[PDB]
Write a protein that binds this DNA or RNA. Sequence first.
DNA 1: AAAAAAAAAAAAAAAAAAAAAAAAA
DNA 2: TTTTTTTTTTTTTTTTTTTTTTTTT
Lengths: 227, 581, 610
Amino acid sequence: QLYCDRYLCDKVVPGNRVTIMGIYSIKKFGLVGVGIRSSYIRVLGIQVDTVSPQEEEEFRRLAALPNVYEVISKSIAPSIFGGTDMKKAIACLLFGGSRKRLPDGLTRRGDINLLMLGDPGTAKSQLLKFVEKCSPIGVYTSGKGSSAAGLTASVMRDPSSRNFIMEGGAMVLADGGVVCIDEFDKMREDDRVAIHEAMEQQTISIAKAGITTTLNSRCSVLAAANS
Amino acid sequence: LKDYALEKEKVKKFLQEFYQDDELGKKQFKYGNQLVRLAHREQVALYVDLDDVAEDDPELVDSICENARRYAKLFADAVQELLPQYKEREVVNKDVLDVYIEHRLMMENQYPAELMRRFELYFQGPSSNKPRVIREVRADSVGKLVTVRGIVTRVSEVKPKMVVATYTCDQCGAETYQPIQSPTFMPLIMCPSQECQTNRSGGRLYLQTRGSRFIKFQEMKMQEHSDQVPVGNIPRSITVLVEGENTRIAQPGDHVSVTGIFLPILRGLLSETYLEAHRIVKMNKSEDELRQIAEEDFYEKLAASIAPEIYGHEDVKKALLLLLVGGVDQSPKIRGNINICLMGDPGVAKSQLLSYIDRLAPRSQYTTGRGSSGVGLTAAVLELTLEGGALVLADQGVCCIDEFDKMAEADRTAIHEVMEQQTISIAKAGILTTLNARCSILAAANPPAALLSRFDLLWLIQDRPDRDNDLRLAQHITYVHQHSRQPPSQFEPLDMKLMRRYIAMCREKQPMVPESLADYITAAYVEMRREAWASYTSARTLLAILRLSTALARLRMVDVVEKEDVNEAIRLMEMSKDSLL
Amino acid sequence: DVELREAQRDYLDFLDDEEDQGIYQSKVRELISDNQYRLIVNVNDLRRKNEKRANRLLNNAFEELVAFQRALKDFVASIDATYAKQYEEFYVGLEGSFGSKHVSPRTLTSCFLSCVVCVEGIVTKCSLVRPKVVRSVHYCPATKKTIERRYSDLTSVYPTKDEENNPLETEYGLSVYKDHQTITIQEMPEKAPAGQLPRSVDVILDDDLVDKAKPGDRVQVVGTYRCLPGKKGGYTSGTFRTVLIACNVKQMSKDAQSAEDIAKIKKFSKTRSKDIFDQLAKSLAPSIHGHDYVKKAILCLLLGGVERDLENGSHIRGDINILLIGDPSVAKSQLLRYVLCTAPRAIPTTGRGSSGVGLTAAVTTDQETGERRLEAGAMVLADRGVVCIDEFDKMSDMDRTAIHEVMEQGRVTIAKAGIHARLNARCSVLAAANPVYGRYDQYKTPMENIGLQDSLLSRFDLLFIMLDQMDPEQDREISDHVLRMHRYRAPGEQDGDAMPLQIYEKHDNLLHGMVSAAFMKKYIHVAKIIKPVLTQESATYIAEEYSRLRSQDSMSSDTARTSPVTARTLETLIRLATAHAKARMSKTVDLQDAEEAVELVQYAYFKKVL
DNA sequence: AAAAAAAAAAAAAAAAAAAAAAAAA
DNA sequence: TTTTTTTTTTTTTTTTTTTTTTTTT
Ligand SMILES: Nc1ncnc2c1ncn2[C@@H]1O[C@H](COP(=O)(O)OP(=O)(O)O)[C@@H](O)[C@H]1O
Ligand SMILES: Nc1ncnc2c1ncn2[C@@H]1O[C@H](COP(=O)(O)OP(=O)(O)O)[C@@H](O)[C@H]1O
Ligand SMILES: Nc1ncnc2c1ncn2[C@@H]1O[C@H](COP(=O)(O)OP(=O)(O)O)[C@@H](O)[C@H]1O
Ligand SMILES: [Mg+2]
Ligand SMILES: [Mg+2]
Ligand SMILES: [Mg+2]
Ligand SMILES: [Zn+2]
């Protein structure tokens, strides 16, 4: 049990891989196990395991290159052979368009959605893995979500605490980034409808017995599939 | 600043010298007679109608409504002081507690007043006091006399609440008395009898229920009418603690206006609230000349008065009229209810008639589709008590079921029992009972032997297009939107309040089927048998004839059914079946 | 106390607003005239007039608020002592721009204790309202003595025996209570990080605020953040329980609700009393192109007809239900999104994102009192509002049949064995649909292009088929509109950067090659209150039109009904006519409204089959 | 279209950890 | 007066049943 303090609170969130330097201490509360005092760590130092102006100018000069598009195209899946057009398209998807909100308030999504149908021999799941490893914010998942990590967000009310717990699927977690859906043709009906709404509006609308809400899922979908 | 001896004098003056001419221009000293009846133990509740007080003392009524419990106690004590000078004879010892009271008085540190009252008093809210919505009854009205309207959602069972506990000592023989105001009380362990105090004895005294005082007690939760809930909110529920002669007056689902006191129960000093009921009135459908009733066309007039804004459907309304009246139960046990199912195409005003019956029938429930399903119809276990569903709340009433076809399969099975057995046999895990649901089912659905064989009448409605028929309906509907009142006709339709009395007046008129009509009815029945055979008619159809024929007999208020009713009853069968074809 | 006296003097001087624009003097006149005893003060005014006072108020909320309230009571006494004597205390609410205090329950750290905080959050808990006593009065029958005891706000002993042990009977009526409630507010799921659980905070509401916010509503609470103590005890843990003692609760739905604007509306209505409806409808969704009839119909949904309540308590809905079946990419979802953005109390939803008890209301057990409690569902929340149901077809049929009652009579009847209720749901449903087979087969009747049964199609008063016809001229026009929209950039505010994660508007050439959304909102809101009455000639015209519509002759060969024509259709006409009347502030449904609604219905109810 | 199997809701029961009050000496 | 054992309350979890939903013939 870790105990944080003034500025150590909320420096970590559950799931982080952390290194803690603290004071091994027991509770001191007005004093078959006899004389056992539950022990805890007094957190003093936290390290969570896993842009400078020079880099900004580096990016500026990188963009200015006449063949910046070519170097980016050949710089995404060098190990994978061929498919130059597909690599160019994936670069375009990574950079995405521009989100537009008209004066009336309507929004035009600026995130590109790409699909790849092919025989199971081509390196397309490898391509999705690279994309999720390269996009600033990115998540890999299968058609039926992932392992104990749903695809789309869900809302449930804690019967005891009666809160509105939002269990985030791949879409909401990947907000502002990329979701790489392998086996995109094997979704479940609820998820099929959810993505149907999300890919266009960029929002997942969920209304449960407790409340209605519209989670913001501004994710670029990169889907792989077989015939 | 606010004396109470003067208040006692004023209330005694009011009670002694107030009068009215209610009974045929006869000044009769309204409350003097009530006091006399109280002194003779022939009346237990004295309702002090504050309208009477305001007639001659507005400031006293203002103070009473501005402070409730104090003036309730003052009126109780004033009635107690007035009782001795109004008693005229000797009571016959109505109950055991009166015998105990007399023995205590004869054997007579004082007897608490509440131990010797045997008479309750309650205020009827002044007419000037508009009834207040439950949601708006807040801290500013704590202890005031407020009247609130609602729907009784759940009323607990009558139980004995002790007002004055009576203990007897094992040494001195004297009685110890303890008034009760808190929900819980500390029983006295030693006797404070002056004899034992002088003797310095153990004084361990034992509580006696023989001498103690018990009062009826019931707890209910009442909701807000759907018409008064805020736009984005849900109805709010308030607790009411009825006692004495205010118990067994309201059942679940009863629309009730209750005038009581908004008092908190002590638990900063945060405190819950409730209403201490003083006057309970059943409103609207729950509410509790002859020349027109004797008319030949009176049968048509009630029919034409059922949802007048619904044009046409002359025959259907006449059939629903019988459902409200219902047949007559015979116990040689055959039910006397009538079940009518309105099946038709969309937008033929099926639901409106179903909704209209709900606002007219005395006891009714309108459940739509799967919104109120499962335990919504039958009962459930909720100490663990048993709460009934729409059927139970609709027992001996009319349960208006809409979209019966799209109902849960289990619910349809439950109804099957009700429309034949008029009971609900549950053998679930936590439930094992046999409810009583003698309710008439009015089903609405859209397009069946599984359903035809059960309902006595299966009326089929088809709005087949027609140039002139549609035009008349459009004139009718557009008129309603233009004036909010059904189009004028030769006769003014009867108001719902008036209709309920008429229908109720016809219920307690059990008629009899003469031997003379047996040959006619048997002759009629056999023909009905062949038509379905030639072209479903079973023994049920004959019963449907008898129940319908009796229903007409009640409308004419003749204790003997006549051949005209059979013809009219069959005529409805003809149209009902002809609707299918 | 020199400091407290200075604070009160400064606050009173501020409230003494006659030399200045007279805003807060007018506000005090308002609060006294309408009989309320709480004032709302914009913090921006304090910052503009006295930065020291504003900073002190925000950083030390309790004593500063006490001084401000005392100054308020003194000022109201000066303006009127009769009213000021009625109320023991005059309270204050705050609002405006809270620089660093404006936070969420997540960001609410202990650093803000004893400060003023303007939090925004989703209400999770609303406890029952309880009367908390503040002043008790006890009467002794024996001694004839009435004793008053005060109870200061220490957020305890209740006398029962007189000095010589004479029982005291509390005087409930003469006792003074203030209604009090506790709510639990939560950070909006939209702004909460997607990973961790929601973070919440308590709020304590005194009188004038006990029921200002209902469960499941997005609210803004301005108040003081302090620590609660434990009960009396020799030992204590350094832990403290913190709550937000609210000084003001506001609904974030500012869209839910000046003489200049009213005059503008009046002049706009009177100028051209013929084509205001068309001008509005054309301006309804500027970003979208085409679909004039659909935009007209939606404009009727926003206005809605008029509800009729007969003498028998009968109900005839005055709201308009619209269905839009469309081929892919025809802007139906965009129109739903616009309706959400504009129409007040516009509840969104999707096909399978709201199953059964979620779409409509529900019933559960409190689980604490063991008492049954209702649950405001997706649509009961949308009372007197719009419900935008996208992907309508994919809904399970059970959900669909769970909407007929609310769609038709606008009330949801839910009853379990313990409890029963008929919640008010007077909402207009706007549904979007993708016809069976994905795309619309024009060589098939609209009946078989729609998998919905006849009854539900009857429920919807208007059913619009929006085909993806590619007529090269029409495609050119649509592409021009779209590309012009995609090129638009905000005026001046933007210069080539990216988006972070008046009666008539100015005429841009990139958006026009219309009326302001705010002006349209105001005009629609004011018009919605009008209650026109059908005219005799209009009634006859509508009756004849309905008679022909039912008649077979009204449909030629190879043209099929998009939905059955029944009694509801007639009402639709009226409602639509009524709607068209409200657009013109008519107060009387003349013939023009009737014939416009008639042509709209005729266009909607018949489709040509190739 | 209807039945069989699965999943989720919901309600009741248990653990339990900690703070406060009443009874005992 | 001061301790102590109980009392509660306040969360949380767990288990059974029922009901609701999904898949197959
Ligand atoms: N063009 C290619 N260049 C490099 N490796 C390839 C190429 N095509 C296939 N592979 C290899 O073949 C394997 C199959 O690729 P994978 O993406 O798993 O196929 P799928 O997406 O159908 O599952 C991968 O491990 C990949 O390394
Ligand atoms: N015969 C009729 N007379 C008057 N109004 C009618 C008639 N038939 C239908 N209506 C109108 O149609 C509307 C909806 O009717 P509804 O009861 O929902 O039809 P159903 O339930 O049979 O589908 C109601 O507002 C009602 O006024
Ligand atoms: N007639 C039109 N005018 C303007 N934009 C259009 C039109 N038709 C399609 N669009 C564009 O195409 C996109 C499709 O919108 P959407 O309604 O979400 O798809 P669908 O109609 O299949 O639900 C929108 O972003 C919209 O900008
Ligand atoms: Mg693969
Ligand atoms: Mg119906
Ligand atoms: Mg869409
Ligand atoms: Zn004794």
